[PDB]
Amino acid sequence: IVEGSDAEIGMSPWQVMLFRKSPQELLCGASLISDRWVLTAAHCLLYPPWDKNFTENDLLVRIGKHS
Amino acid sequence: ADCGLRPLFEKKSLEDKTERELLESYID
Amino acid sequence: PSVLQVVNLPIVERPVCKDSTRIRITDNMFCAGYKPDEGKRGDACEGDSGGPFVMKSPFNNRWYQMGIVSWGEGCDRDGKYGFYTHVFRLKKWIQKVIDQ
Amino acid sequence: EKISMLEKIYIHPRYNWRENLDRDIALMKLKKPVAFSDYIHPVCLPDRETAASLLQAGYKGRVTGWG
């Protein structure tokens, strides 16, 4: 985040992290809109212009992490 | 239905360090 | 970074948005940030994408996801705003599949 | 924290990854419904009244991440 500050524990509980798992590499961010639903940017999953066509197999998510 | 309320803040009748900034900026 | 990071920002007006980019601005997106005069600094960067845009309601005190960090042109640049997916606008869609 | 597996991925039928990231949005239906805690908890999607009233010039939004 350009020119912000560190959150406080609990603050951003919908905070979901899109990761790769193959090896491990954080790609994007997202949010928990439910217990079985994540909301994200389309371009995080697929942007051909940059070689980016992840499929379910391709990722894992980490809920409730706040560094 | 318990969407947006936050166990470590809104439920403990609590507030974060910059949430007053969001609220001062609005007009409902 | 080192810890989750937080940054609060002003939804900026249509005209001022359109004016800051060559790219075609749609109905589904919105810019937010401080104008170069407004003094205050800050913004989104890469791997921030997808991140939420939330606002706390005065009505109830629950937060709402106002948008999705959608695109930019750099980060903290005077004169450029950050584009956001207009959540309210794709909600019918969001409906459809969750309920589907 | 909590790691999660994906079951499906949904991408806005009309994403414009080609022209100008129009409708940049994807849903990730989790595999296994997560358990809310003091660091895991949904977020709200707005209704016509909260959007109309909130979505406005000079009205501050909060942004978070690890970019």
Min Cα distance D54 → chain B (Å) is: 7
Which residues sit opposite C68 in a β-bridge? Answer: C52, C85
Longest CA–CA separation in chain D, Å: 41
Amino acid identity, position B17: K
2-21 of B, contacting C, C-beta below 8 A: 3-6, 10, 18-19, 21
Domain range for D34: 1-67
Number of domains in chain C: 1
Q: Which residue segment(s) compose the domain that C14 sits in?
A: 1-100
Please check whether residue A4 touches B, CB under 8 A. Answer: no
- Number of structural domains (chain D) is 1
CA-CA distance, C70 to C23, in Å (whole number)?
A: 13
- C-alpha to C-alpha distances, A10 to A6, C4, C48, D40, nearest whole angstrom: 12, 11, 19, 8
Task: Report CA D35 to chain centroid distance, whole Å.
Answer: 18
Contact C79, C46 (CB under 8 A): no
Please report the resolution in angstroms: 2.5
Nearest residue on chain C to D55, alpha-carbon basis: C11
Nearest to C85 by CA among A1, D12, D53, A48: D12
What CATH number is associated with residue C45?
2.40.10.10
Residue D50 sits in a domain whose CATH number is: 2.40.10.10
Here the tokens at position C62 are 């629950």
What is the second-level CATH architecture of the domain A1-67? Beta Barrel (2.40)
Whole-angstrom distance, CA of residue C36 vs CA of residue C52:
24
**Per-position DSSP letters for chain D, written without gaps between them:** -EEEEBS--EE-TT-BTTTT-BT--EE--BSS----BTTB---BPP-HHHHHHHS-TT-EEEEEE--
**Which residues of chain C does B22 touch, with a Cβ-Cβ cutoff of 8 Å?**
8, 55-56
Which residue of C3, C4, C5, C62 is the best one to mutate when testing the B interface, meaning the one whose CB has the most B CBs within 10 A? C62
- Determine the residue among A6, A11, A12, A66 to mutate to test chain B binding: the one whose Cβ has the most chain B Cβ atoms within 10 Å: A11
Q: Which three-class secondary structure state does DSSP give residue C84?
A: strand
**Per the structure block, which two tokens stand in for B2?**
């318990």
Which among A11, A39, A48 is the nearest to D17, CB-wise? A48
CATH number of B1-28: 4.10.140.10
Chains that touch D (3 or more CB pairs under 8 A): A, B, C
Q: How far apart are CA C5 and CA A6, in angstroms?
A: 4
Between chains, do B6 and A13 touch, taking CB under 8 Å as contact? yes
Domain ranges of chain A: 1-67
Burial (CB count within 10 angstroms: exposed 0-12, middle 13-18, buried 19+), residue C96: exposed
Residues on chain C touching B21 (C-beta within 8 angstroms): 8
**C-beta of residue A11 within 8 angstroms of C-beta of residue D39:** no
